[PDB]
Each structure stands twice: as structure tokens, then as C-alpha cells.
Amino acid sequence: TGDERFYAEHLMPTLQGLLDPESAHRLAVRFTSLGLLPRARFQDSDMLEVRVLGHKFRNPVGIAAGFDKHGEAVDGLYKMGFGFVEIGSVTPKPQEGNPRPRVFRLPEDQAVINRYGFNSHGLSVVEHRLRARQQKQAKLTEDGLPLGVNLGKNKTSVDAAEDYAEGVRVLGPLADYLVVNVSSPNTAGLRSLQGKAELRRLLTKVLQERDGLRRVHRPAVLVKIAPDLTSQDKEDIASVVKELGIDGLIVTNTTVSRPAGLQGALRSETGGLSGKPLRDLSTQTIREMYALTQGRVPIIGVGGVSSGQDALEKIRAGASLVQLYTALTFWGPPVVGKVKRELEALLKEQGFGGVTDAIGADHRR
Template sequence: MALRLKLRLIRTFVITSSGLIVYTIADKFYEPVLKPALQLLDPESAHDFAVFAAKHGLVPKDKGKDWSGLACEVWGRQFENPIGLAAGFDKHGECVDAMLSAGFGFVEVGSVTPEPQEGNPKPRIFRLEKDRAVINRCGFNSVGSSLVSERLRRRLAHIHSAQPGVVGVNLGKNKDTEDSKLDYEKGVVTFADIADYLVINISSPNTPNLRNLQQKNQLADLLEHVIAVRDASLKERSPKARPPILVKISPDLTDEELQDIVDICLKLSVDGMVISNTTVQRPHDLVEAKLAAEKGGLSGPPLKDISTSIIQKVYRMTDGRLVIIGVGGVSSAEDAYDKIRAGASLIELYTALAYEGPGIIRKIKTGLSELLQRDGFQSVQEAVGKNVLVSSSQYGMRN
């Protein structure tokens, strides 16, 4: 059966059986029913189908009640819980409310480029099933900032019916743009008045020379520019009402490079860091060795410890002065808790959603609540950086 026909049949089933699909997508039916159906499709088609289902309201709402201690305030914004959807799922701003209603406390849209672009040739996403991981080399495939902006503005125009939650926008650059500053400037100007926060993505391994923007001089020049653009475009707003600007960094940096980035972020009063993007490293214990040879960024459990280690380093380097969004290999409450104790105020996931289904959101929130209360914390914010403070005091470091 041709791939296109398979996709058409599944879509037809979804549309004509919308009453049943809610239960089909529910966690207890994901493994035996929906997951095998999605595996008939290549990974990118399966992703497109998932977005399609969410866009048409076919993802079940999280009807559970969050523990009050999961609510947190970051940058003066209220988060119902600290678990967010990482950039890469809703690239085009199509299903924000559906994913918020599924239980996420926030959603990061993108990456969005100023002009539409196809990205890299297909196939460009690969499942490492036995490792519960994914390799992608999408290359910022995007419908462009105008269309994404239009969708988000339309949502805000009907804010009374929108799902509560924080919405960030992850900004990328077009592949052929020579002056990167201009692309990020366009992104900031387009989204500054509608995004709750903005992420400057300079760490995808799939756009040529993008990671060079993490180098000291280039990064300082870029961040100084985008901060000035944000402030100028929203000069009528108080500084606290302007969207925070964050930098998304690579997990493949040396300690020296990481220190340079941290110093620049502190000097320029950048509001936070997203740690981390996918990695070009290939851990020696990957089971899917043949697929691991594919070029691109690796996500999922093999990235977990790498990203958590960097979170802890940055928290220690900054003495907790930068807000950290921790992302990379989160597939359980324990994974989220480890990143919080390492210094992350907020957590994002994506790959686990592809393998486990939307039920993973409730599982993580419930388990995280239990872990926090077990250890005597009244709120998630009390646990942020706790491991760093403990290790620092053991070695006589400032805490």
C-alpha cells in the first residue's frame, strides 16, 4: 500500500470517527492501537498526522487537577505547571490551544524563519526505536513568520476562548541569509508584541554555520542587537511587560565556550537560556547503531544526562541568576525532577511525546508532584538548583 494512501486512510478514519479517536489517543490505548498505526508512516508523516489530529481537536484534554505546588511565576508570568512542549512539534503555530489543553503549562512554537523555506531534503527524521530516540536534520522547515504570526494573532483576538497558558516563539534564520542579525531582527519585530517569550535559536546542527553564532564576538553582537530591537519596538511598554529573550544553546560546547556564552548573557541581561538543543554526539551505547550513523541532531534519552550536566554547570556559573528551561531526554517525572534540581525553572519535552503519547504529560506532572512533596518542597520553585547548592556547599563554594 502506498504511503500516501495509508496516510489518507488514517486521516479519513480520524475525521469520521472523532468520537472514538479521543479514547484511542488516550494513554491506555496508545501503545496497542494508535502507535502501531503511526508506525505504518515514516516519522515525518507521523508527526504531521499528530499535528493534524491536535489541530482538529482530536487530542484528549487533561482533566486531572495539578498539585498547587506545580504553579510557578517566571519573568512575572504565571505558569500553571512547569512542563512545556519544546519547539519542533508545533513548528507553524497550528495547535497551541490543543497542546495546552492536553496538560502542558506552556508551548514553544517554532522554529520560525522570516521567509518560508522547505528545509533539508527528505527523509530527514529517523526513529531509533530501541533507544527511544530520534535523529532529525530538518533544517528549519517553516511556513514563515507572516503566517505563524497571523495564526497567533488570530488566537489572541479570541482570547476568551483560548486555553490558558504561556506561549513562546522560537526564532531561526533562513538558510541563505548572509546577515543573520537581520533575520533575528525580523523575528523579534514580528513576534515581540504577541509572544510571552522569545528564543534566539543559534544551536541547531542542521543549518550551515548556525552554531558559529555561539562564538563570543558574534553572539555578543547578535544579542545586543535583538535586545535593542525588542526594546525599540515596544518602547511604550515597561521593561517587565516586554517579552523575555532567551538563547537556545548546543549541548556540544566546551566548558570555555559555555563560560563565554554565560558571561555575555549576564553582561547583556539576557533573560534566560534553553538548555539544550539536539546533539551531534553519538553515545557509544546506542543500540540502533546503523541509524545512529545518520547525520543530524540526536534527541531523547541519550541526550538526557548531557543536557542535565550543562544545566548544572550554567546554574553554578550564573549563581542562579539566569532562568533556565531544561530540555533533552525528559521522559519521566524523575528526568524532569533531575533537571529542576540541577537548576532548571521550567522543563520542555517532545521526543517522549512521540513515543509515549499525550498521557505522558499527566504522568510526569503527577510523578513530579509526588517527588517534590516526598522531599519536603512546598513548590517546584523551592527545588530549583538544589543539587547545585548542595554540591557547592560540600566544596566550600558560594551557595
């Protein structure tokens, strides 16, 4: 389409030439929040509907955590055509995150490196922001546009499990699903919570807190994992998720690896790498986690999605839903309708009745 070409070829590269990435992010959130974007033209086909995690998703393309960290732009993100929105990560207390600069573009790689370090307005501010639109969200969710909330932990926390428990208590009642984010590369010791013993203790506490919420306020609980896990780590996570009845996995966060071939001048910056160089590392992690959970644990697939093909590869590997972030930063809002249009076309070409028929299809070949 003309908008896709205009944004991708002219407007976004021009604005990126003018603005440092964190300034660009802040202006993107402000513009989205104000609805200063035409309403998406693409009308969602019945082929794109997914029923998973106790909810209807009008389309399987979500905005990944970290774009709307503080729940400021939720309605603008639905207006952009996302089938679901995930906010956060949110930490219990407000915290500033790492010193600036902490976000870096790798244009030659269609990648970003970030070390934000969980900059967060904190649970109380986000709670009041979501409460201001709680019944609007109830109607959106009923109409197939669910809301996820991603929970983090404060830098100076002495008890990680209590940070996540506080998040469940405060934002669980406002969420369709919660994400226990134990895979940020930018908080010291956080990824150690993916270990078997630490994860079983942490997730038992999180599920007990969730189960204590009133039924209409009781969200699904997902664990978001790194792309950098050992085979042992992945087997341990699969075992714990099945043992405790965790509702789903988000696969994956950013990578601390630096794949051979990166060209960006900023490739050796500390932080998590996102975008195209992460794509197939994430797809293969989805594939492994689907097999280790016997296809019984819903997966939200994320990492380097910028086309219908990228989305369908993750769905065929075992994802019920996908998310994107970094593609939005390069191609702008038109990328959402592009992914959905291309995904519909490919499902038809490959003989799938809809997204649901394609979930895990590669494992049945």
C-alpha cells in the same frame, strides 16, 4: 493509568509501524490542532506553579520547539496539559528545509534523529496565525499558560543578526518570550553564532529590537544552546548573558554527538539526536550553566524528559521549567499528565513545598 499503558504499549507502536516519522508528525499536528484528543484529566496542583520570565506558569512542563513549527496546534497543546507552548523555529522567509527523508526513529534507544533544516511557513504566515488568536492567548497567559516563539534564520541569509531582528519585530509583539535559536545542528554555520564575539553582537541587536517594542508587547528573550559546547563556549555564553541582561537560557537543543551504546539501525544518520540518550548530557549542561550564572538566570531544561524523575533532576540541577518533545512521539499525549503526576509525587517525597523550592536544590547540598 490505563490510557498511559494503552498509548505506550499498543496505539503509538502500532501507528509508528504504519507511518514514516515525518508523516506521523504531520498527522499528530493535524489531530492536535483539531482537538481530536480527549482534554487532559490531570488538574494542576498549586505545587506545580512557577513564576519566572515575568509570567505565571500553571505547571512547569512545556512542549519544546519543533513540534508546532508554524503555530498551528497551540490551543490543542494547552488542551494536552502543557503549562506553556513554544512554537517554531520560524524563519523570516518561508523555506522548505532539507530533502526527505529527514526524520528517523531509534526505537531501541527511545531516541529520534532529525535534519529538518528549519522547514518554516515564515514570519508573515505565523504572524497572521497568532494574530487570529492574539486575545485568546492574552487570556491563556493571564491564566498561567504562556506562549514562547522560537526564531531561526533562513539558509541563504547574508546577515544572521538581521534575520533574528526581523523575527523580534514581527513575532515579539505576539510572544510572552522569544528564543534566539543559535543551536540547530541542521543549518551550516548557525552554531558558530554561540561564539563570544558573534553572540555579543547578535544578542545586543536582538535586545535593542525587543526594547523598542511597546511595553505590553515586550517579550522576555532567551538563548537556546547546544549540548555540544566546550567549557570555553559555556563560560563565554554565561559571561555575555549576564553582561547584556538576557532573560533566560533554554538548555539544550539536540546533540550532534552519538553517545556510545546507541542500538538503532539509523544511529549514523546525520542530524540532531533527541530523547533518552540526550537526557543526562542536557541535565549536566543545565547544572553547568546554572553555576556559571550564579542561579540568577532562569533556565528552561530540555532533553530526554519522559518522567517526573527526569523533570525533577533538571529542576534540581537549576531548571525553573522543563520541556519535552521526543517522549510525546513514543508515549503519546498521556505522557504529559504522567510527568506532572510523578513530579508532584516526588516533590512531596523529597520534602519540597513546590517546584519553586526544588529549583537548583542540588547546588545547595
